[PDB]
Design a protein around this ligand. Structure first.
Ligand SMILES: *[C@@H]1O[C@H](CO)[C@@H](O)[C@H](O)[C@H]1NC(C)=O
Lengths: 15, 494
């Protein structure tokens, strides 16, 4: 991942 | 027990619905699915794994890409156009293909040797790609694409918004953009566009996205909605409006929906107060598209005829992205003659005035990731998905505080996709987590066969038709007869 993650869907699914 | 589609050995990414047939298309890792409106499986197309490297260019073969390793292919973009299904994966620099509607297995168009203007989608599953399809001024279909910044591998030079040809004179040029069919923007890595949604209304295309405000020492992300004319393949008309949910306190837009008074479309968007960790709250904010257009129109009119100023003198418009352009003092006949601009009008325009909204609802500890909005008897009902895989239903009419009247787990710990969509009649909602897609009825009034259970399962749709002996919707209580609303707790059975 990265600290570029602003989407909670992205965090849930990929982080 | 709701109808579901739970595919084994894969994860879901995108859901697209054909509005003419109701057929559903599901983009998954290494798979595309064609589903009936009742989630019956009509076709399965494998899209991976493939040999790939972010440092290699398609078509990827061992001789020219020695570093290629087997790579899985999460779907990055899935869109129904009038004549085809547009599909862009995460592999092969985000190249796209077109498949036949109602026969997913048949390829219609896939450029054989794609070039640098045909790398469409982000080649990283964690970077979002949004799209919308529209008919252009030459009668041919266009694909607007909002693509976030990717750092790893070649392809950090792809413009953040582009307008690409789906059926150009030469099929091999499909998905490429003309030289001016892009938002020309430098410092892409610094702005770091994050796209959330793209939609159309009337003659305009709209983009919802996050990007760094480089005029603030924080260099903090802000939410924007941008409007561009829908059909010309140019960005002359691009205008960027900041979004302010409770003044920007809820700053990170997550998901949105548009719902329908003539041209009374309203944009409902969810915003998180806090970014995901390397606690917090979410809000639902409403922005009527008429207000969106007035501010965009006022921005344009000020930039075109009053040097960026409103009629009171206030500075309201300016040129973004350090482009060598300035607002102007053109004759006022410009506004009716070139609503969408020209290759000499000021561009790209932005508003100093944010679009403001006071939250419909504020929920602590919930990170909303999905929004869909409908109406029943003139009053708004919102279906909202969160980061923990739950679907909430909220009556927004008179008598409500914005608290949900129903909360159900679709899949614990797997966020609901922003690709939440209704069916044609707004009687069912298609809800998707990373592993399952559900067809959810918006109301289950008929399941109750006595008055008491009708009124006890409180639901804004459901009430007891006295002279019919049925738990129904108000529209179904007629042969308008007496209807006991289940959402009036001070009122009971007779
Ligand atoms: C914005 O301007 C266009 C033409 O310039 C007009 O057709 C449209 O109705 C305007 N929208 C609003 C909300 O005033």
């Amino acid at each position: 991942c990265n600290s570029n993650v602003l989407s909670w869907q992205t965090y849930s699914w990929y982080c | 027990p709701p109808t579901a589609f739970t595919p084994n050995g894969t994860y879901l990414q995108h859901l697209a619905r054909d509005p003419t047939s109701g057929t559903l298309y599901l983009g998954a890792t290494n798979f595309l699915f064609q589903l009936s409106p009742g989630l019956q499986l009509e076709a399965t197309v494998s899209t991976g794994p493939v040999l790939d490297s972010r440092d290699c260019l398609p078509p990827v073969m061992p001789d020219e890409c020695p570093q290629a390793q087997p790579t899985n292919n999460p779907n990055q973009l899935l869109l129904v156009s009038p004549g085809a299904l547009v599909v862009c994966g995460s592999v092969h620099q985000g190249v796209c293909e077109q498949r036949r509607l109602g026969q997913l297995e048949q390829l219609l168009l896939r450029p054989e040797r794609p070039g640098d203007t045909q790398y469409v989608a982000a080649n990283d599953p964690a970077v979002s790609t949004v799209g919308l399809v529209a008919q252009g001024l030459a009668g041919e279909p266009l694909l607007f694409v909002g693509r976030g910044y990717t750092s790893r591998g070649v392809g950090g030079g792809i413009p953040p918004i582009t307008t690409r040809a789906l059926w150009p004179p030469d099929p091999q040029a499909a998905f490429s953009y003309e030289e001016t069919a892009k938002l020309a923007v430098g410092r892409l890595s610094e702005y770091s566009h994050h796209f959330v949604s793209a939609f159309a209304r009337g003659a305009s295309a709209y983009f919802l996205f996050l990007r760094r405000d480089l005029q603030a020492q924080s260099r903090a992300f802000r939410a924007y909605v941008s409007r561009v004319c829908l059909r010309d393949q140019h960005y002359y008309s691009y205008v960027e409006l900041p979004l302010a949910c409770e003044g920007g306190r809820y700053g990170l837009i997550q998901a949105a929906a548009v719902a329908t008074v003539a041209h009374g479309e309203v944009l409902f968007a969810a915003f998180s107060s806090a970014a995901p960790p390397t606690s917090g709250a979410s809000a639902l904010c409403a922005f009527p598209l008429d207000e969106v257009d007035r501010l965009a129109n006022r921005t344009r009119d000020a930039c075109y005829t009053r040097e960026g100023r409103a009629e009171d003198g206030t500075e309201v418009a300016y040129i973004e992205y350090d482009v060598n352009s300035d607002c102007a003092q053109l004759p006022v006949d410009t506004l009716d003659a070139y609503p969408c601009g020209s290759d000499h009008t000021p561009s790209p325009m932005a508003s100093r005035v944010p679009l403001e909204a006071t939250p419909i609802l504020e929920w602590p500890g919930i990170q909303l990731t999905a929004v869909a909005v409908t109406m029943e008897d003139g009053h708004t009902i919102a279906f909202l998905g969160d980061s923990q895989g739950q679907l909430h239903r909220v009556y927004l009419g008179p008598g409500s505080d914005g608290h949900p009247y129903s909360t159900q787990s679709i899949q614990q710990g797997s966020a609901v996709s922003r690709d939440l969509t209704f069916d044609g009649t707004f009687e069912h909602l298609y809800v998707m987590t990373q592993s399952t897609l559900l067809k959810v009825p918006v109301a289950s009034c008929a399941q109750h066969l006595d008055c008491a259970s009708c009124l006890a399962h409180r639901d804004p749709y459901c009430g007891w038709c006295v002279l019919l002996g049925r738990c129904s919707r108000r529209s179904e209580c007629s042969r308008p007869e007496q209807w006991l609303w289940s959402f009036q707790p001070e009122l009971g059975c007779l």
